[PDB]
């Protein structure tokens, strides 16, 4: 019961995307650009709908350089996957949680069953252990 | 004729993103966080093919407000777009060129034509016109 690698998940809905500088509590690990992915199946649970198993959200995560008054996307650190699964990952709430380190497929990175990705989301019970809300 | 405004477009490929701070040369009217969609069409030639008619890019632009050293999206302030149609355009080189205040479909910003996006965007006539590349 590994969480699945995204593939093709680069053309999915486009979320929302937000900047963490020095300075910011989450700069160490989450500093950089980074968006926010969606598959079909999480857009009906984000909408306010309920979330499918099967619905995948994902938080793609660019280093990013300074370039006279812009910040331009640099290098892929990791992507943050989330994959939904009641009874499969039902120990940390329905959702399975993985990293891979540069959005590679071979770089797993979480080692703990997903518990320490699971404790900061749980603050977010109410709507489902998801942070991102849908923009227009 | 004018350039249609493009329905659907937050559902289409997000290619990229860039934030324009105060300072920079485009910060008028272009300053904020900015994420750059295609069409299906579109796609075709940012992977190197011929862009053919129909296809579309869209730059939405975001106000943002710096808290705690993230940079959080706020309101819309306009989306620019250039739809392809090699006849209809051949004024400004084969790609029509209209804004729309808020991403509403009632507030067109261009009053000249196009000839004003067209004088920059000429730059990139190597590349059909487009500045942004792919990336994965
Ligand atoms: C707090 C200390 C966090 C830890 C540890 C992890 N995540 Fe997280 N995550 C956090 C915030 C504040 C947000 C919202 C970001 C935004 O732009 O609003 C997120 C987001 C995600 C997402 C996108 C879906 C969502 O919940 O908004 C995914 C797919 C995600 N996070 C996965 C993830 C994984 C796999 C983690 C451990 C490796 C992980 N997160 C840790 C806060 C925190
Ligand atoms: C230089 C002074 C510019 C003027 C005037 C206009 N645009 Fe532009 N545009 C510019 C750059 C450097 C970029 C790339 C930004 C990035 O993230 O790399 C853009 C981008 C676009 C796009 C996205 C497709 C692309 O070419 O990268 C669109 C749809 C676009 N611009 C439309 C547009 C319109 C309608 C303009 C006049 C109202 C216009 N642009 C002006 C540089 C400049
Ligand atoms: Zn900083
Ligand atoms: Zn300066």
């Known amino acids: 019961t590994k969480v699945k690698y995204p593939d093709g998940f680069r053309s999915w809905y486009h979320v929302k ?10 700069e160490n690990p989450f500093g950089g650009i980074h968006h926010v992915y969606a598959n079909a199946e ?6 306010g709908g309920n979330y499918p198993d099967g619905a995948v959200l994902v938080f793609d995560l660019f280093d990013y350089q300074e370039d006279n008054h812009a910040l331009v996307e640099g290098k892929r650190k990791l992507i943050g996957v989330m994959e939904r699964d009641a009874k499969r990952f039902s120990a940390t709430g329905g959702w399975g949680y993985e990293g891979f380190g540069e959005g590679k497929p071979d ?11 699971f404790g ?11 942070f991102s809300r849908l923009r227009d």
């Open 42 to 47: 999480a857009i009906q649970g984000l909408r």
């Open 17 to 26: 995307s937000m900047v963490i500088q020095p300075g910011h509590p989450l």
């Open 107 to 117: 770089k797993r990175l979480v080692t703990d069953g997903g518990q320490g990705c």
């Open 120 to 130: 900061c989301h749980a603050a977010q019970k109410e709507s489902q252990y998801v």
